């Protein structure tokens, strides 16, 4: 309202600017994928300028319609929306990268994405199934050199189909593999990974900072907690007593504390909500600040709780979460 023409962004290592608060669009299987349309419209209306999705989420038709609808009605311009998609692991083969991006863009009915990520570093066999399995129920993994996948990502950026390219769920070793690649043209702008006060990623964050790679935090509110992907006996982040005490002190909410913690440590933070009140609330992250002693307290919550292990993909050497970081 006073001035919605400006918003907080960070400069990426390719010269583009990423808004530091992103809207998460994934919703669990029981929610119809038609509900994404209204939520993204509300997010844009509330002041979200970064919107995160993926081929895998099966929502790109709805997400794209929401964005085009808010442009067509004058609420926002394309250049003031930062839209992220992701390449699913059935399309890591380098010949399949551009086809997967074009398919996303066709669903979205947008001419480009602002950011395209390698979704998850374990490759699976190509085909229409997102999770291909053999007669024994075993996932059919694929042997793909991610360096060759990255080259294909770079060509997407050169063709203008993605303004920026980055990675997701990469560990130290995998990031170094890309950074040391022969003939590297574009460093990844970001590594999008799980990050919240119970798994604050300080080692991986500092490695990213040392390379001017932005860490983008997912499940920053403690995740969707969807079974079987998240164990229901994992601790509920937003019931943490230090977060709740800080929220009460600031007259905010635990969610807001968790989001603000990320902003102050130089992380770009995602937040999914399909609720009008919570969508609005989340944008209050820009209205208050945490002191150094509050930030120290939150750092003290770190406790090795990874909600999303994605261990259905464990086994191959690119499985990213068996290394320390
Ligand atoms: N790269 C990847 O592999 C990957 C993996 C996971 C996620 N992501 C991305 O990151 C996004 C966020 O992660 P997430 O989906 O795990 O969820 P998340 O943002 O951590 O949030 C989880 C929950 O918080 C609730 N919530 C939101 N605002 C709240 C508030 N102010 N107070 C209380 N509760 C609040 C939501 O419910 P309500 O909706 O009911 O408000 C939602 O169930 C995803 O949607 C996706 O875009 C990426
Ligand atoms: C965003 C997220 O947490 C990811 C991690 C694992 C992903 C799921 C993995 C299994 C899967 C297979 C499908 O066929 C539909 C999408 C789903 C149900 C995925 C939805 C998005 C998930 C839940």
UniProtKB/Swiss-Prot annotation:
Keywords: Cytoplasm, Disease variant, Lipid metabolism, NADP, Oxidoreductase, Steroid metabolism. Changing residue 33 to A/M: Increases the low androstenedione reductase activity. It catalyses: a 3alpha-hydroxysteroid + NADP(+) = a 3-oxosteroid + NADPH + H(+); a 3alpha-hydroxysteroid + NAD(+) = a 3-oxosteroid + NADH + H(+); 5alpha-androstane-3alpha,17beta-diol + NADP(+) = 17beta-hydroxy-5alpha-androstan-3-one + NADPH + H(+); 5alpha-androstane-3alpha,17beta-diol + NAD(+) = 17beta-hydroxy-5alpha-androstan-3-one + NADH + H(+). Substrate binds at residues 26, 119, 224, 229. Its main location: cytoplasm. It is found in: Cytoplasm, Cytosol. Cytosolic aldo-keto reductase that catalyzes the NADH and NADPH-dependent reduction of ketosteroids to hydroxysteroids. Most probably acts as a reductase in vivo since the oxidase activity measured in vitro is inhibited by physiological concentrations of NADPH. Displays a broad positional specificity acting on positions 3, 17 and 20 of steroids and regulates the metabolism of hormones like estrogens and androgens. Works in concert with the 5-alpha/5-beta-steroid reductases to convert steroid hormones into the 3-alpha/5-alpha and 3-alpha/5-beta-tetrahydrosteroids. The active site is at 57 (proton donor). One of its GO terms (biological process) is steroid metabolic process. Belongs to the aldo/keto reductase family. It is linked to 46,XY sex reversal 8: A disorder of sex development. Affected individuals have a 46,XY karyotype but present as phenotypically normal females. It comes from Homo sapiens. Pathway: Steroid metabolism. Changing residue 303 to A: Decreases 3-alpha-hydroxysteroid reductase activity about 50-fold. Gene3D superfamilies: NADP-dependent oxidoreductase domain. NADP(+) binds at residues 22-26, 52, 168-169, 192, 218-224, 272-282. Changing residue 224 to Q: In SRXY8; partially impaired activity. The keyword NADP applies. Expressed in fetal testes. Expressed in fetal and adult adrenal glands. Inhibited by hexestrol with an IC(50) of 2.8 uM, 1,10-phenanthroline with an IC(50) of 2100 uM, 1,7-phenanthroline with an IC(50) of 1500 uM, flufenamic acid with an IC(50) of 0.9 uM, indomethacin with an IC(50) of 75 uM, ibuprofen with an IC(50) of 6.9 uM, lithocholic acid with an IC(50) of 0.07 uM, ursodeoxycholic acid with an IC(50) of 0.08 uM and chenodeoxycholic acid with an IC(50) of 0.13 uM. The oxidation reaction is inhibited by low micromolar concentrations of NADPH. GO terms for molecular function: aldose reductase (NADPH) activity; androstan-3-alpha,17-beta-diol dehydrogenase (NAD+) activity; androsterone dehydrogenase [NAD(P)+] activity; bile acid binding; carboxylic acid binding; estradiol 17-beta-dehydrogenase [NAD(P)+] activity; indanol dehydrogenase activity; ketosteroid monooxygenase activity. This is Aldo-keto reductase family 1 member C2. Its EC number is 1.-.-.-, 1.1.1.112, 1.1.1.209, 1.1.1.53.
